[PDB]
């Protein structure tokens, strides 16, 4: 009974979080009312990992919904599966965070954090043996970014020896809400370097390009982007939610994926990604070629610009496990210049029989590549472009921050980049 407590904060956090629960609930057979209507025991074997069991054979997600304004969560509560969440697990304010990291982290957020921790404590107290936490949020706004990382710091203070993982949506000028996104992202990245064991970096620019170029969507919406994140989140947690010869909790996964404590920012990937020629069967060779193609990866980083420290791939569906090994060993042994040679056997593959909804088979890619430094370089560049002129800084000094804190975040992230650069050589 290795439970995971899920937390989703802010607009992005809750909309991506909502679709995540919508997807896995479907895979586990839970309907919008929380009643199980599946047909296989495999759907219930590891069901307690993400769901609590109430009276009458009901299943309630172990999810805490946090936000500083009521809008997004009011939409979730009225959404498809909105009825399935514990009413007490909605923690929200009314002021909002105005896309301001300082407001979510120091002022508006500080006022609300204790009641969120009150709900986390309540969910953890009922866990037979807490694996750890996972948080969905964006880094470019105010609540998910500023208050999200405040929550991580206070969760760590209270549960220091538990695993803390995040799915973090990185900002991009191409898919931007406000110009202060580099400020909020750089401030958040410093918190994450210290206080998370694994952070899946989801670049809104990569999500957009995939919807536009690969999926052939003329005008992608946030919903379209969130469909991709839902599918990816379901894929990375497949080995936690379904039975198999894996027998690995969050800590064992982290131990084997993170060779250095600060270099724990992952590039996720999914396959297939087909436009609507969608019923065609996808061969294992096609799954492997796509899953390793940059155009299928969601960090907007070209893996050929760096080297993989570690790689993990989950295959879902009824396929030839012999053919899976042949193709995976065919990709490494045909691009060995992009894997570090000083970590023996740093590519691990798993297979799961249960495929996602409406897919004969799929592949989810989890890569710890030094090419992720390109993502932090872009953020650092945009940050400095404004900070050198102190542009838009008054929004943050008015919340009690000093310029010194900005200088430090800058250095911390440039250090992170320099740290990636030296392991790539």
């Amino acid at each position: 009974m290795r439970e995971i407590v899920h937390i989703q904060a802010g607009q992005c956090g809750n909309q991506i979080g909502a679709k995540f629960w919508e997807v896995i609930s479907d895979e586990h057979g839970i309907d919008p009312t929380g009643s199980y209507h599946g047909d296989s025991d495999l759907q219930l074997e590891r069901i307690n990992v993400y769901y609590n069991e109430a009276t009458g054979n009901k299943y309630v997600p172990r999810a805490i919904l946090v936000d500083l304004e009521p809008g997004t969560m009011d939409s979730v509560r009225s959404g498809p599966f909105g009825q399935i969440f514990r009413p007490d697990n909605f923690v929200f304010g009314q002021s909002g965070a105005g896309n301001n990291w300082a407001k979510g982290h120091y002022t508006e957020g500080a006022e609300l954090v204790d009641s969120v921790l009150d709900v986390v404590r309540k969910e953890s107290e009922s866990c037979d043996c807490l694996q750890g936490f996972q948080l969905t949020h964006s880094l470019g706004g105010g609540t998910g970014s500023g208050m999200g990382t405040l929550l991580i710091s206070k969760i760590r203070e209270e549960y220091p020896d538990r695993i803390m993982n995040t799915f973090s949506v990185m900002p991009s000028p191409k898919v931007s809400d406000t110009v202060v996104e580099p400020y909020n992202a750089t401030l958040s990245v410093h918190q994450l370097v210290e206080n998370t064991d694994e952070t899946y970096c989801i670049d809104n620019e990569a999500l957009y390009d995939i919807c536009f170029r690969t999926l052939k969507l003329t005008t992608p919406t946030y919903g379209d982007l969130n469909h991709l994140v839902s599918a990816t989140m379901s894929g990375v947690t497949t080995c936690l939610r379904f039975p198999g010869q894996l027998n690995a909790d969050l800590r064992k996964l982290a131990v084997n994926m993170v060779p250095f404590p600060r270099l724990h920012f992952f590039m996720p990937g999914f396959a297939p990604l087909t436009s609507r020629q969608q019923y065609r069967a996808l061969t294992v060779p096609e799954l492997t070629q796509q899953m390793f193609d940059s155009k299928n990866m969601m960090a907007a980083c070209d893996p050929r610009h760096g080297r993989y420290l570690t790689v993990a791939a989950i295959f879902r569906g009824r396929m030839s496990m012999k053919e899976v090994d042949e193709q995976m060993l065919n990709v490494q042994n045909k691009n060995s210049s992009y894997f570090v040679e000083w970590i023996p056997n740093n590519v691990k593959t798993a297979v799961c029989d249960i495929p996602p909804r409406g897919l004969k088979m799929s592949a989810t890619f989890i890569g710890n590549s030094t090419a992720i430094q390109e993502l932090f370089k872009r953020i650092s560049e945009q940050f400095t472009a404004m900070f050198r002129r102190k542009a838009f800084l008054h929004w943050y000094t008015g919340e009690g921050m000093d310029e010194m804190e900005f200088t430090e975040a800058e250095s911390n992230m440039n250090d992170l980049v320099s740290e990636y650069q030296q392991y790539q050589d």
């Binding site: 042949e326 060993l329 042994n333 040679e341």
Partner: protein, 352 residues
């Protein structure tokens, strides 16, 4: 797309094989420490064989037979010939040899002196040559006292073998020589003999009344090109190829190279390699091996062939690099990693 690594930057041969592999556009070279490779061009000493054939999904090939040193070491070859029933001590094509350890260190010192006294008393020619693998350090002498004292002044194992006092002398010139043959053994253990050999001749007249000057007795390419004063007079680089050496034997001795010499050379290659096959074969091993060998022979005035030594990391004649190196890639490398004639080799068939 096949990958290989290079771990011997001093191999003239495989430096060309590596150059050809890349030219095919179907082989890729990796760093010398990358374990994900198909072919290893390994180092000469302490090649980590134990780390081959454990990479999932990789067929790994190496250009050295683990255990072939038994054949390519002076004192090892002597012990192998005397203790191998396939070869016996009555081996008719290997000069009488003994393993002699310096007195500062089994050993065959007393056994050597026994046969030595027999020759001295029997009026027979009793000239021996002392040598060791630690040589560029050779001593040819007719007195046993000098041979043993030369070994004690050193500190490594030596071998004393009979000096062929009646070597076949080429004419004109009255000069010694030796025959180098290159032999390729592939993963299946087919024994291929390169159709092209070389004679490394001595540019000096053979003088049997003065072993002091080691220029007319040692036919090495370095000694002839450093101390001999008539280097390159009769043949360019003191190297005569089979076509010329064959026409000479027809005009001089009314015999051919095949009948008079090559039958014995092929017999000696088969005997040595078949002997150690059970000990070094990779047929049932987790990796595959091949190796190029340099056999060095002597020919006496009776047209009998003698085995001198076997070189495990041999060089090649400048003129024969292209053809031989291509032959390696054809039968040794591509035979296991095929790419998207009239063979240059002579398959010495045998039973495995």
């Amino acid at each position: 797309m096949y990958t290989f690594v290079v771990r011997d930057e001093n191999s003239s041969v495989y430096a060309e094989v590596s150059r050809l592999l890349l030219a095919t556009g179907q082989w890729k070279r990796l760093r010398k420490d990358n374990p994900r490779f198909n072919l290893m061009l390994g180092e000469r000493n302490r090649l980590p064989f134990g780390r081959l054939g454990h990479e999932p999904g990789l067929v790994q090939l190496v250009n050295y037979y683990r255990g072939a040193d038994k054949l390519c070491r002076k004192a090892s070859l002597v012990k192998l010939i005397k203790t191998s029933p396939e070869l016996s001590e009555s081996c008719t094509w290997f000069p009488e040899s003994y393993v002699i350890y310096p007195t500062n260190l089994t050993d065959e010192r007393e056994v050597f002196l026994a046969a030595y006294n027999r020759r001295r008393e029997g009026r027979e020619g009793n000239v021996w040559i002392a040598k060791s693998s630690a040589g560029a350090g050779i001593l040819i002498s007719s007195e046993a006292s000098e041979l043993l004292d030369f070994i004690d002044e050193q500190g490594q194992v030596h071998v004393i073998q009979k000096y062929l006092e009646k070597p076949l002398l080429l004419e004109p010139g009255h000069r010694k020589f030796d025959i180098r043959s290159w032999v390729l053994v592939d993963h299946l253990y087919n024994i291929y003999l390169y159709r092209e050999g070389v004679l490394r001749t001595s540019s000096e007249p053979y003088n049997s009344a003065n072993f002091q000057d080691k220029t007319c007795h040692l036919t090495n390419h370095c000694i002839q090109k450093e101390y001999s004063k008539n280097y390159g007079r009769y043949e360019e680089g003191n190297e005569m190829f089979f076509e010329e050496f064959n026409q000479y034997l027809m005009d001089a001795l009314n015999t051919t190279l095949e009948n008079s010499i090559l039958l014995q050379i092929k017999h000696i290659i088969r005997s040595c390699l078949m002997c150690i096959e059970p000990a070094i074969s990779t047929k049932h091993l987790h990796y595959q091996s091949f190796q190029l060998f340099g056999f060095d022979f002597m020919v006496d005035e009776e047209l009998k062939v003698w085995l001198i030594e076997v070189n495990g990391a041999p060089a090649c004649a400048q003129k024969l690099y292209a053809e031989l190196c291509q032959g390696i890639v054809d039968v040794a490398i591509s035979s296991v990693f095929p790419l998207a004639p009239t063979s240059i080799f002579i398959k010495l068939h045998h039973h495995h």
